[PDB]
């Protein structure tokens, strides 16, 4: 019954990533005064299937890889970690109920930079690596503020249990008391996943080749599935963290509906933002963190440690 419950989490994730690609192309289209996919299946509902079948029958590129082992680890590591990040999410009950769910998710996402680093080193092209190194410095940079911001929030929740975040926001969303942190959190999840205006990997491809340049259609398609899995998961986490739905233990499915709608609307705000702004230059997205977000994140971390004490509002430990 648990093996089933795992496949009731893995398979639906892959299908959501499949149909996020349709939703992305159609939302971008209508913001650009066009229709987007609407020919392959009714309203483009078969576009993801055609793209999927097309890529896996495509002739593979020539690996020409320096390290065969690290060539195959990178996609396996990326895909496996992306699926693993979903096991502690309370929707409203987690698949695995962890007492340190927040650290488990924070710790697991820190390993996601190995896929970037390995594939770049295994690519066998010198400009591919400098692409991977530039991306890694961006990923680990915006992890810093995510950890500190997450630390600040958990000082009003009182635990690392992800299901305790629901109880904290039973009376009111944490978006009110922590909107300065929700702003910098939301951006850092854009930069964490390498999304516009932070998708320097795709934008500067000609200047510096991206790390995923060497993989064939099938293997490259897997790198891409892991990347939207993270984007959906980081907005599900954004919803639980700052827009906590109320849980009625007799009607759990009502939580799952209201919860799901909030996850989509943030996930479609990623698409909304992609269609609205130009890209950052690399030294500018490093300036934004080390010289804007980090000073404010540290000041608000100091504030959110002092505030519970001076208002007598320290949350329970249990």
């Amino acid at each position: 019954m648990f093996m089933i419950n795992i496949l009731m989490l893995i398979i639906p994730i892959l299908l959501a990533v499949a149909f996020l690609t349709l939703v992305e192309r159609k939302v971008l289209g209508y913001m650009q005064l066009r229709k987007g996919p609407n020919v392959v299946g009714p309203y483009g509902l078969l576009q993801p299937i055609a793209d999927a079948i097309k890529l896996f029958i495509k002739e593979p590129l020539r690996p020409a890889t320096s390290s065969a082992s690290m060539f195959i680890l990178a996609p396996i590591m990326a895909l496996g970690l992306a699926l693993t990040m979903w096991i502690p999410l309370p929707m409203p009950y987690p698949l695995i109920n962890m007492n340190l769910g927040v650290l488990f998710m924070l710790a697991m996402s820190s390993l996601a930079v190995y896929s970037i680093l390995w594939s770049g080193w295994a690519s066998n092209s010198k400009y591919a690596l400098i692409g991977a190194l530039r991306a890694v410095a961006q990923t680990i940079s915006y992890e810093v503020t995510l950890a500190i911001i997450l630390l600040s929030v958990l000082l009003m929740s009182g635990s690392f249990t992800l299901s305790t975040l629901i109880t904290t926001q039973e009376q009111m969303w944490l978006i009110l008391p922590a909107w300065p942190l929700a702003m910098m959190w939301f951006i850092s999840t854009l930069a964490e996943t390498n999304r516009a205006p932070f998708d320097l990997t795709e934008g500067e491809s000609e200047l510096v080749s991206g790390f995923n340049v060497e993989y064939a259609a099938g293997p490259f398609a897997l790198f891409f599935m892991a990347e939207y899995a993270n984007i959906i998961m980081m907005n599900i986490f954004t919803a639980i963290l700052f827009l906590g739905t109320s849980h009625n233990p007799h009607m759990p499915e009502l939580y799952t509906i209201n919860f799901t709608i909030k996850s989509l609307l943030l996930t479609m705000s990623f698409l909304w933002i992609r269609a609205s702004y130009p890209r950052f230059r690399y030294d500018q997205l490093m300036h934004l963190l080390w010289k804007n977000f980090l000073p404010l994140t540290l000041a608000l971390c100091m504030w959110h440690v002092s505030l519970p004490i001076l208002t007598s509002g320290i949350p329970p430990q249990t």
């Binding site: 066009r34 996919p37 097309k54």
Partner: protein, 158 residues
């Protein structure tokens, strides 16, 4: 149920063909003027993406090369380089007089008289430039050309 091998191969062939024509990611050499009409084929009025044809594709994920402008002798080696890097199945669409056969610089010393001297071409789109609608007709002709492929059916009878 009961089914022959011939029937199975015909249906699988229809599946892969439907996928390949439904998801045509084009690489575009915007060599000259004809690239401007290629850009109008992506703009709102025609919107090639609604057919499943992505606006921008990398050379090594592309399915079709669209040669939109004059191919000069200085540029010909680079175009053949890109063509070789493209993974199969690969198709070339020749757009406009210049690429089709040299056009209005056909008698020039610096111009390749047609891109079929460099790479194999599947569809020729006439015009100087072809209208965005004329290019769209050409791409839809490539989809029908792909629909009629019989790779599996031939393989069975080998």
């Amino acid at each position: 149920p009961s089914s022959r091998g011939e029937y199975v191969v015909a249906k699988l062939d229809d599946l892969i063909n439907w996928a390949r024509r439904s998801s045509l990611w084009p690489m575009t050499f915007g060599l000259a003027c004809c690239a401007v009409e290629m850009m109008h084929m992506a703009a709102p009025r025609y919107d090639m993406d609604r057919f499943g044809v992505v606006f921008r594709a990398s050379p090594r994920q592309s399915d079709v090369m669209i040669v939109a402008g004059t191919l000069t002798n200085k540029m010909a080696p680079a175009l053949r380089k890109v063509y070789d890097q493209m993974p199969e199945p690969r198709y070339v669409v020749s757009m406009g007089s210049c690429a089709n056969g040299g056009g209005y610089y056909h008698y020039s010393y610096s111009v390749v008289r047609g891109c079929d001297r460099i790479v194999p071409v599947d569809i020729y789109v006439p015009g100087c430039p072809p209208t965005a609608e004329a290019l769209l007709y050409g791409i839809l002709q490539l989809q029908k050309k792909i629909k009629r492929e019989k790779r599996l059916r031939i393989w069975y009878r080998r």
